[PDB]
Design an enzyme around this catalytic site. Sequence first.
Site, PDB file in Angstrom:
ATOM      1  N   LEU A 127       1.240  -1.359   0.116  1.00 29.06           N
ATOM      2  CA  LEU A 127       0.158  -0.304  -0.117  1.00 29.06           C
ATOM      3  C   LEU A 127       0.487   1.685  -0.188  1.00 29.06           C
ATOM      4  O   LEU A 127       0.088   2.322   0.352  1.00 29.06           O
ATOM      5  CB  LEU A 127      -1.343  -0.128   0.875  1.00 29.06           C
ATOM      6  CG  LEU A 127      -1.796  -1.497   1.329  1.00 29.06           C
ATOM      7  CD1 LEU A 127      -2.948  -1.205   2.512  1.00 29.06           C
ATOM      8  CD2 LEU A 127      -2.681  -1.176  -0.274  1.00 29.06           C
ATOM      9  N   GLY A 128       2.183   1.258   0.707  1.00 29.24           N
ATOM     10  CA  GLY A 128       3.232   2.405   0.206  1.00 29.24           C
ATOM     11  C   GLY A 128       3.616   2.538   1.722  1.00 29.24           C
ATOM     12  O   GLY A 128       3.501   1.714   2.703  1.00 29.24           O
TER      13      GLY A 128
ATOM     14  N   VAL B 274       6.367   0.791   6.286  1.00 29.49           N
ATOM     15  CA  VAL B 274       6.078  -0.052   5.078  1.00 29.49           C
ATOM     16  C   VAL B 274       4.425   0.143   5.931  1.00 29.49           C
ATOM     17  O   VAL B 274       4.117  -1.166   6.654  1.00 29.49           O
ATOM     18  CB  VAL B 274       6.470  -0.871   4.370  1.00 29.49           C
ATOM     19  CG1 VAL B 274       6.161  -1.808   3.179  1.00 29.49           C
ATOM     20  CG2 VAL B 274       7.926  -0.277   3.881  1.00 29.49           C
TER      21      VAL B 274
ATOM     22  N   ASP C 128      -2.747  14.544  16.958  1.00 28.08           N
ATOM     23  CA  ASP C 128      -2.255  14.928  15.709  1.00 28.08           C
ATOM     24  C   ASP C 128      -3.020  15.127  14.909  1.00 28.08           C
ATOM     25  O   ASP C 128      -2.961  14.413  13.442  1.00 28.08           O
ATOM     26  CB  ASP C 128      -0.488  14.240  15.606  1.00 28.08           C
ATOM     27  CG  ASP C 128       0.219  15.033  13.546  1.00 28.08           C
ATOM     28  OD1 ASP C 128      -0.155  16.025  13.781  1.00 28.08           O
ATOM     29  OD2 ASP C 128       0.830  13.434  13.677  1.00 28.08           O
TER      30      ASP C 128
HETATM   31  C1  R1L Z   1       1.183   5.738  -1.701  1.00 32.48           C
HETATM   32  C2  R1L Z   1      -0.420   6.552  -2.558  1.00 32.48           C
HETATM   33  C3  R1L Z   1      -0.754   5.042  -2.742  1.00 32.48           C
HETATM   34  C4  R1L Z   1      -0.954   6.146  -0.682  1.00 32.48           C
HETATM   35  C5  R1L Z   1      -1.846   6.672  -0.214  1.00 32.48           C
HETATM   36  C6  R1L Z   1      -1.704   8.190  -0.088  1.00 32.48           C
HETATM   37  N1  R1L Z   1      -2.189   9.416  -0.144  1.00 32.48           N
HETATM   38  C7  R1L Z   1      -2.325   6.196   1.227  1.00 32.48           C
HETATM   39  O1  R1L Z   1      -3.548   6.730   1.384  1.00 32.48           O
HETATM   40  N2  R1L Z   1      -1.285   5.768   2.528  1.00 32.48           N
HETATM   41  C8  R1L Z   1      -0.424   5.595   2.143  1.00 32.48           C
HETATM   42  C9  R1L Z   1       0.621   4.488   2.649  1.00 32.48           C
HETATM   43  C10 R1L Z   1      -0.245   3.781   3.313  1.00 32.48           C
HETATM   44  C11 R1L Z   1      -1.688   3.895   3.405  1.00 32.48           C
HETATM   45  N3  R1L Z   1      -2.510   3.164   4.720  1.00 32.48           N
HETATM   46  N4  R1L Z   1      -1.409   3.372   5.976  1.00 32.48           N
HETATM   47  C12 R1L Z   1      -2.824   2.534   7.137  1.00 32.48           C
HETATM   48  C13 R1L Z   1      -2.974   2.951   8.441  1.00 32.48           C
HETATM   49  C14 R1L Z   1      -2.738   3.949   9.436  1.00 32.48           C
HETATM   50  C15 R1L Z   1      -2.026   3.311  10.812  1.00 32.48           C
HETATM   51  C16 R1L Z   1      -2.108   2.762  10.832  1.00 32.48           C
HETATM   52  O2  R1L Z   1      -1.848   2.393  12.124  1.00 32.48           O
HETATM   53  C17 R1L Z   1      -2.616   2.782  13.555  1.00 32.48           C
HETATM   54  C18 R1L Z   1      -2.258   2.651  14.672  1.00 32.48           C
HETATM   55  C19 R1L Z   1      -2.898   3.640  15.373  1.00 32.48           C
HETATM   56  C20 R1L Z   1      -3.645   3.850  15.506  1.00 32.48           C
HETATM   57  C21 R1L Z   1      -4.697   3.824  14.032  1.00 32.48           C
HETATM   58  C22 R1L Z   1      -3.851   2.806  12.824  1.00 32.48           C
HETATM   59  C23 R1L Z   1      -2.249   1.041  10.752  1.00 32.48           C
HETATM   60  C24 R1L Z   1      -2.022   1.629   9.303  1.00 32.48           C
HETATM   61  F1  R1L Z   1      -2.244   0.513   8.479  1.00 32.48           F
HETATM   62  C25 R1L Z   1      -4.115   2.001   6.045  1.00 32.48           C
HETATM   63  C26 R1L Z   1      -4.995   1.653   6.102  1.00 32.48           C
HETATM   64  N5  R1L Z   1      -5.122   0.967   7.935  1.00 32.48           N
HETATM   65  N6  R1L Z   1      -6.001   1.093   5.259  1.00 32.48           N
HETATM   66  C27 R1L Z   1      -5.541   1.128   4.230  1.00 32.48           C
HETATM   67  N7  R1L Z   1      -4.641   1.285   3.494  1.00 32.48           N
HETATM   68  C28 R1L Z   1      -4.068   2.069   4.442  1.00 32.48           C
HETATM   69  C29 R1L Z   1      -1.902   5.400   3.323  1.00 32.48           C
HETATM   70  N8  R1L Z   1      -0.082   7.524  -2.417  1.00 32.48           N
HETATM   71  C30 R1L Z   1       1.029   8.697  -2.327  1.00 32.48           C
HETATM   72  C31 R1L Z   1       0.191  10.009  -2.523  1.00 32.48           C
HETATM   73  N9  R1L Z   1       0.278  10.355  -3.845  1.00 32.48           N
HETATM   74  C32 R1L Z   1      -0.514  10.649  -4.125  1.00 32.48           C
HETATM   75  C33 R1L Z   1       0.923  12.565  -4.422  1.00 32.48           C
HETATM   76  O3  R1L Z   1       0.573  11.904  -6.338  1.00 32.48           O
HETATM   77  C34 R1L Z   1      -0.774  11.413  -6.197  1.00 32.48           C
HETATM   78  C35 R1L Z   1      -0.651   9.266  -4.726  1.00 32.48           C
HETATM   79  C36 R1L Z   1      -0.872   7.411  -3.941  1.00 32.48           C
END
Ligand code: R1L
Length: 267
Positions: A20-21, A24, A130
Amino acid sequence: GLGYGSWEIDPKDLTFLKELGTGVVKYGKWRGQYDVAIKMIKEGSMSEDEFIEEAKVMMNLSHEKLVQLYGVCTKQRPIFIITEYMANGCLLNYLREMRHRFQTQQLLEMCKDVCEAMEYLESKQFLHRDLAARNCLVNDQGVVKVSDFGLSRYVLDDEYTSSVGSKFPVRWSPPEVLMYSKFSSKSDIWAFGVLMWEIYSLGKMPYERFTNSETAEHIAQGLRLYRPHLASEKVYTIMYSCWHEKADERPTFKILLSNILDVMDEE
Ligand SMILES: CC(C)(/C=C(\C#N)C(=O)N1CCC[C@@H](n2nc(-c3ccc(Oc4ccccc4)cc3F)c3c(N)ncnc32)C1)N1CCN(C2COC2)CC1
Protein backbone atom coordinates in the site's frame (compact mmCIF):
# COMPACT_ATOMS: atom_id res chain seq x y z
CA GLY A 1 -3.75 -18.96 21.62
CA LEU A 2 -0.90 -20.04 23.90
CA GLY A 3 1.94 -17.49 23.85
CA TYR A 4 -0.12 -14.48 22.67
CA GLY A 5 -1.72 -11.90 24.96
CA SER A 6 -5.09 -10.33 24.03
CA TRP A 7 -3.26 -7.43 22.32
CA GLU A 8 -0.91 -9.70 20.38
CA ILE A 9 -1.60 -11.08 16.93
CA ASP A 10 0.23 -14.19 15.73
CA PRO A 11 1.94 -13.00 12.53
CA LYS A 12 1.57 -16.53 11.13
CA ASP A 13 -2.16 -15.74 10.85
CA LEU A 14 -1.37 -13.08 8.24
CA THR A 15 -1.49 -13.44 4.47
CA PHE A 16 0.19 -10.51 2.69
CA LEU A 17 -1.56 -9.51 -0.57
CA LYS A 18 -0.62 -5.96 -1.70
CA GLU A 19 1.89 -3.18 -1.00
CA LEU A 20 0.00 0.00 0.00
CA GLY A 21 3.05 2.26 0.14
CA THR A 22 5.00 3.92 2.88
CA GLY A 23 6.82 2.56 7.87
CA VAL A 24 5.68 0.25 5.06
CA VAL A 25 2.00 -0.71 4.99
CA LYS A 26 0.50 -3.79 3.36
CA TYR A 27 -2.97 -5.11 2.67
CA GLY A 28 -3.67 -8.71 3.64
CA LYS A 29 -5.92 -11.21 5.34
CA TRP A 30 -6.08 -12.49 8.91
CA ARG A 31 -6.92 -16.23 9.23
CA GLY A 32 -7.71 -16.36 5.54
CA GLN A 33 -10.98 -14.43 5.74
CA TYR A 34 -10.68 -10.96 7.28
CA ASP A 35 -9.24 -7.91 5.52
CA VAL A 36 -6.56 -6.13 7.48
CA ALA A 37 -3.86 -3.54 7.01
CA ILE A 38 -0.41 -4.31 8.38
CA LYS A 39 1.88 -1.42 9.25
CA MET A 40 5.52 -2.41 9.75
CA ILE A 41 7.18 -0.03 12.23
CA LYS A 42 10.64 1.19 11.10
CA GLU A 43 13.29 0.09 13.60
CA GLY A 44 14.43 2.96 15.84
CA SER A 45 11.42 5.14 14.98
CA MET A 46 9.17 4.38 17.96
CA SER A 47 9.29 4.04 21.75
CA GLU A 48 8.15 0.43 21.39
CA ASP A 49 7.61 -0.72 25.00
CA GLU A 50 5.56 2.40 25.75
CA PHE A 51 3.56 1.98 22.53
CA ILE A 52 2.87 -1.70 23.29
CA GLU A 53 1.52 -0.83 26.74
CA GLU A 54 -0.68 1.88 25.19
CA ALA A 55 -1.85 -0.53 22.46
CA LYS A 56 -3.67 -2.40 25.28
CA VAL A 57 -5.71 0.75 26.00
CA MET A 58 -6.22 1.42 22.29
CA MET A 59 -7.66 -2.11 21.83
CA ASN A 60 -10.58 -1.10 24.07
CA LEU A 61 -11.41 1.93 21.91
CA SER A 62 -14.19 0.97 19.52
CA HIS A 63 -16.25 3.33 17.39
CA GLU A 64 -17.50 3.01 13.84
CA LYS A 65 -15.64 6.24 12.81
CA LEU A 66 -12.35 5.27 14.48
CA VAL A 67 -9.88 3.02 12.64
CA GLN A 68 -9.89 -0.22 14.65
CA LEU A 69 -6.62 -1.49 16.12
CA TYR A 70 -6.80 -5.31 16.04
CA GLY A 71 -3.47 -5.96 17.74
CA VAL A 72 0.30 -5.83 17.42
CA CYS A 73 2.96 -8.36 16.45
CA THR A 74 5.79 -7.76 18.89
CA LYS A 75 7.90 -10.95 19.09
CA GLN A 76 10.05 -9.55 16.30
CA ARG A 77 11.52 -6.68 14.33
CA PRO A 78 10.01 -4.76 12.73
CA ILE A 79 6.91 -4.87 14.94
CA PHE A 80 3.55 -4.86 13.11
CA ILE A 81 0.42 -2.86 13.84
CA ILE A 82 -2.69 -4.68 12.55
CA THR A 83 -5.72 -2.54 11.78
CA GLU A 84 -8.93 -2.20 9.89
CA TYR A 85 -8.35 -1.96 6.14
CA MET A 86 -9.37 1.40 4.59
CA ALA A 87 -9.49 0.82 0.84
CA ASN A 88 -9.56 4.45 -0.27
CA GLY A 89 -6.50 5.42 1.71
CA CYS A 90 -5.52 8.76 3.15
CA LEU A 91 -8.20 11.48 3.43
CA LEU A 92 -5.73 14.14 2.30
CA ASN A 93 -5.07 12.35 -1.01
CA TYR A 94 -8.79 11.54 -1.42
CA LEU A 95 -9.67 15.23 -1.11
CA ARG A 96 -7.02 16.21 -3.64
CA GLU A 97 -8.37 13.84 -6.33
CA MET A 98 -10.58 16.28 -8.25
CA ARG A 99 -12.27 13.45 -10.17
CA HIS A 100 -14.51 12.83 -7.17
CA ARG A 101 -16.36 16.11 -7.86
CA PHE A 102 -17.58 16.24 -4.30
CA GLN A 103 -20.83 17.88 -3.31
CA THR A 104 -20.67 20.03 -0.21
CA GLN A 105 -23.07 17.57 1.47
CA GLN A 106 -20.33 14.93 1.10
CA LEU A 107 -17.73 17.30 2.58
CA LEU A 108 -19.99 17.96 5.58
CA GLU A 109 -20.51 14.21 6.08
CA MET A 110 -16.70 13.77 6.17
CA CYS A 111 -16.58 16.43 8.90
CA LYS A 112 -19.36 14.65 10.79
CA ASP A 113 -17.56 11.29 10.53
CA VAL A 114 -14.46 12.81 12.10
CA CYS A 115 -16.42 14.78 14.69
CA GLU A 116 -18.22 11.59 15.84
CA ALA A 117 -14.90 9.80 16.30
CA MET A 118 -13.49 12.78 18.19
CA GLU A 119 -16.62 13.08 20.40
CA TYR A 120 -16.05 9.40 21.26
CA LEU A 121 -12.34 9.97 22.05
CA GLU A 122 -13.29 13.06 24.11
CA SER A 123 -15.78 10.92 26.08
CA LYS A 124 -12.89 8.52 26.87
CA GLN A 125 -10.54 11.43 27.82
CA PHE A 126 -8.24 10.28 24.98
CA LEU A 127 -6.46 13.09 23.07
CA HIS A 128 -5.58 12.56 19.48
CA ARG A 129 -2.61 14.97 19.63
CA ASP A 130 -2.07 15.13 15.82
CA LEU A 131 -5.48 15.45 14.17
CA ALA A 132 -5.22 16.38 10.47
CA ALA A 133 -6.51 15.09 7.13
CA ARG A 134 -3.25 13.17 6.63
CA ASN A 135 -4.19 11.14 9.78
CA CYS A 136 -7.64 10.12 8.59
CA LEU A 137 -8.46 7.22 6.26
CA VAL A 138 -11.35 6.47 3.89
CA ASN A 139 -13.04 3.09 3.43
CA ASP A 140 -14.58 1.53 0.31
CA GLN A 141 -17.95 3.17 1.13
CA GLY A 142 -16.45 6.66 1.41
CA VAL A 143 -16.69 6.74 5.21
CA VAL A 144 -13.91 8.75 6.87
CA LYS A 145 -12.31 7.39 10.04
CA VAL A 146 -9.77 8.85 12.43
CA SER A 147 -6.38 7.10 12.47
CA ASP A 148 -3.04 7.17 14.30
CA PHE A 149 -4.79 8.40 17.45
CA GLY A 150 -2.28 9.29 20.22
CA LEU A 151 0.65 7.87 18.27
CA SER A 152 2.77 11.02 18.31
CA ARG A 153 3.58 10.24 21.97
CA TYR A 154 5.84 7.34 20.85
CA VAL A 155 7.77 9.02 18.00
CA LEU A 156 11.52 9.19 18.68
CA ASP A 157 12.55 11.63 15.92
CA ASP A 158 12.76 14.97 17.80
CA GLU A 159 11.99 16.89 14.54
CA TYR A 160 8.39 15.66 15.10
CA THR A 161 8.08 15.98 18.88
CA SER A 162 8.04 19.69 19.74
CA SER A 163 7.56 23.15 18.17
CA VAL A 164 11.39 23.45 18.06
CA GLY A 165 11.29 20.55 15.54
CA SER A 166 11.14 20.91 11.76
CA LYS A 167 8.32 18.29 11.32
CA PHE A 168 5.95 19.47 14.09
CA PRO A 169 2.28 20.15 13.04
CA VAL A 170 2.53 23.91 13.42
CA ARG A 171 -0.33 24.57 10.98
CA TRP A 172 -2.74 22.46 13.10
CA SER A 173 -1.67 23.94 16.48
CA PRO A 174 -3.34 26.57 18.66
CA PRO A 175 -1.38 29.51 20.12
CA GLU A 176 -1.00 27.88 23.55
CA VAL A 177 0.67 24.83 21.95
CA LEU A 178 3.03 26.97 19.87
CA MET A 179 3.79 29.34 22.80
CA TYR A 180 3.77 26.98 25.78
CA SER A 181 3.30 23.30 24.67
CA LYS A 182 -0.10 23.32 26.35
CA PHE A 183 -1.95 20.28 24.94
CA SER A 184 -5.57 19.69 25.91
CA SER A 185 -8.96 18.73 24.55
CA LYS A 186 -8.97 22.26 23.15
CA SER A 187 -5.85 21.71 21.06
CA ASP A 188 -7.67 18.77 19.42
CA ILE A 189 -10.62 21.14 18.88
CA TRP A 190 -8.35 23.67 17.15
CA ALA A 191 -6.91 20.94 14.93
CA PHE A 192 -10.41 19.74 14.05
CA GLY A 193 -11.28 23.22 12.81
CA VAL A 194 -8.19 23.16 10.62
CA LEU A 195 -9.25 19.69 9.36
CA MET A 196 -12.68 21.09 8.40
CA TRP A 197 -10.79 23.81 6.52
CA GLU A 198 -8.71 21.12 4.75
CA ILE A 199 -11.89 19.24 3.77
CA TYR A 200 -13.66 22.34 2.40
CA SER A 201 -10.45 23.39 0.63
CA LEU A 202 -10.14 20.02 -1.13
CA GLY A 203 -6.84 19.32 0.60
CA LYS A 204 -4.96 22.60 0.24
CA MET A 205 -2.19 23.05 2.76
CA PRO A 206 -3.36 25.42 5.55
CA TYR A 207 -1.60 28.83 5.26
CA GLU A 208 -0.22 27.62 1.94
CA ARG A 209 1.72 30.83 1.17
CA PHE A 210 3.45 30.92 4.60
CA THR A 211 6.24 29.00 6.20
CA ASN A 212 5.66 27.32 9.56
CA SER A 213 7.50 30.22 11.23
CA GLU A 214 5.27 32.77 9.53
CA THR A 215 2.18 30.73 10.40
CA ALA A 216 3.12 30.73 14.08
CA GLU A 217 3.49 34.52 14.04
CA HIS A 218 0.17 34.99 12.11
CA ILE A 219 -1.68 32.88 14.70
CA ALA A 220 0.06 34.47 17.67
CA GLN A 221 -1.05 37.91 16.29
CA GLY A 222 -4.67 36.63 16.40
CA LEU A 223 -5.05 36.11 12.66
CA ARG A 224 -6.62 33.01 11.15
CA LEU A 225 -7.40 30.97 8.09
CA TYR A 226 -10.30 32.36 6.12
CA ARG A 227 -13.36 30.88 4.48
CA PRO A 228 -12.90 28.22 1.78
CA HIS A 229 -14.96 28.88 -1.31
CA LEU A 230 -16.98 25.70 -0.77
CA ALA A 231 -17.92 26.48 2.86
CA SER A 232 -21.23 28.16 3.55
CA GLU A 233 -21.36 30.90 6.15
CA LYS A 234 -22.76 28.40 8.69
CA VAL A 235 -19.98 25.88 7.99
CA TYR A 236 -17.37 28.64 8.25
CA THR A 237 -18.85 29.71 11.61
CA ILE A 238 -18.35 26.16 12.92
CA MET A 239 -14.72 25.81 11.84
CA TYR A 240 -13.90 29.37 13.00
CA SER A 241 -15.36 28.62 16.47
CA CYS A 242 -12.54 26.12 16.91
CA TRP A 243 -9.96 28.92 16.70
CA HIS A 244 -10.81 31.17 19.66
CA GLU A 245 -7.62 32.58 21.14
CA LYS A 246 -8.91 31.51 24.57
CA ALA A 247 -8.96 27.73 24.70
CA ASP A 248 -11.86 27.66 27.18
CA GLU A 249 -14.06 29.54 24.68
CA ARG A 250 -13.69 26.80 22.04
CA PRO A 251 -16.56 24.28 21.83
CA THR A 252 -16.50 20.62 22.80
CA PHE A 253 -16.80 17.87 20.21
CA LYS A 254 -20.37 17.24 21.42
CA ILE A 255 -21.28 20.86 20.69
CA LEU A 256 -19.52 20.73 17.30
CA LEU A 257 -21.45 17.57 16.44
CA SER A 258 -24.74 19.26 17.27
CA ASN A 259 -23.73 22.23 15.13
CA ILE A 260 -22.79 20.02 12.19
CA LEU A 261 -26.08 18.11 12.42
CA ASP A 262 -27.99 21.40 12.49
CA VAL A 263 -26.24 22.58 9.33
CA MET A 264 -26.87 19.23 7.62
CA ASP A 265 -30.59 19.64 8.40
CA GLU A 266 -30.62 23.26 7.19
CA GLU A 267 -28.51 22.67 4.05
C1 R1L B 1 1.34 5.62 -1.80
C2 R1L B 1 -0.09 6.14 -2.00
C3 R1L B 1 -0.74 5.13 -2.98
C4 R1L B 1 -0.85 5.96 -0.71
C5 R1L B 1 -1.48 6.88 0.07
C6 R1L B 1 -1.62 8.29 -0.13
N1 R1L B 1 -1.74 9.42 -0.26
C7 R1L B 1 -2.16 6.35 1.27
O1 R1L B 1 -3.38 6.31 1.24
N2 R1L B 1 -1.49 5.90 2.35
C8 R1L B 1 -0.03 5.90 2.53
C9 R1L B 1 0.39 4.43 2.58
C10 R1L B 1 -0.33 3.71 3.72
C11 R1L B 1 -1.86 3.87 3.60
N3 R1L B 1 -2.51 3.26 4.76
N4 R1L B 1 -2.07 3.36 6.06
C12 R1L B 1 -2.85 2.71 6.88
C13 R1L B 1 -2.60 2.63 8.33
C14 R1L B 1 -2.58 3.77 9.10
C15 R1L B 1 -2.35 3.67 10.46
C16 R1L B 1 -2.11 2.42 11.04
O2 R1L B 1 -1.86 2.31 12.38
C17 R1L B 1 -2.70 2.77 13.34
C18 R1L B 1 -2.15 3.02 14.58
C19 R1L B 1 -2.93 3.49 15.61
C20 R1L B 1 -4.28 3.67 15.42
C21 R1L B 1 -4.85 3.39 14.19
C22 R1L B 1 -4.06 2.96 13.14
C23 R1L B 1 -2.10 1.28 10.26
C24 R1L B 1 -2.35 1.40 8.93
F1 R1L B 1 -2.33 0.28 8.18
C25 R1L B 1 -3.89 2.10 6.07
C26 R1L B 1 -5.02 1.30 6.30
N5 R1L B 1 -5.38 0.92 7.55
N6 R1L B 1 -5.75 0.94 5.24
C27 R1L B 1 -5.42 1.32 4.03
N7 R1L B 1 -4.40 2.08 3.74
C28 R1L B 1 -3.62 2.48 4.73
C29 R1L B 1 -2.23 5.37 3.52
N8 R1L B 1 -0.15 7.53 -2.54
C30 R1L B 1 0.65 8.69 -1.93
C31 R1L B 1 0.13 9.90 -2.42
N9 R1L B 1 0.09 10.02 -3.95
C32 R1L B 1 -0.31 11.29 -4.34
C33 R1L B 1 0.86 12.27 -4.53
O3 R1L B 1 0.68 12.11 -5.95
C34 R1L B 1 -0.57 11.40 -5.85
C35 R1L B 1 -0.73 8.91 -4.51
C36 R1L B 1 -0.40 7.57 -4.01
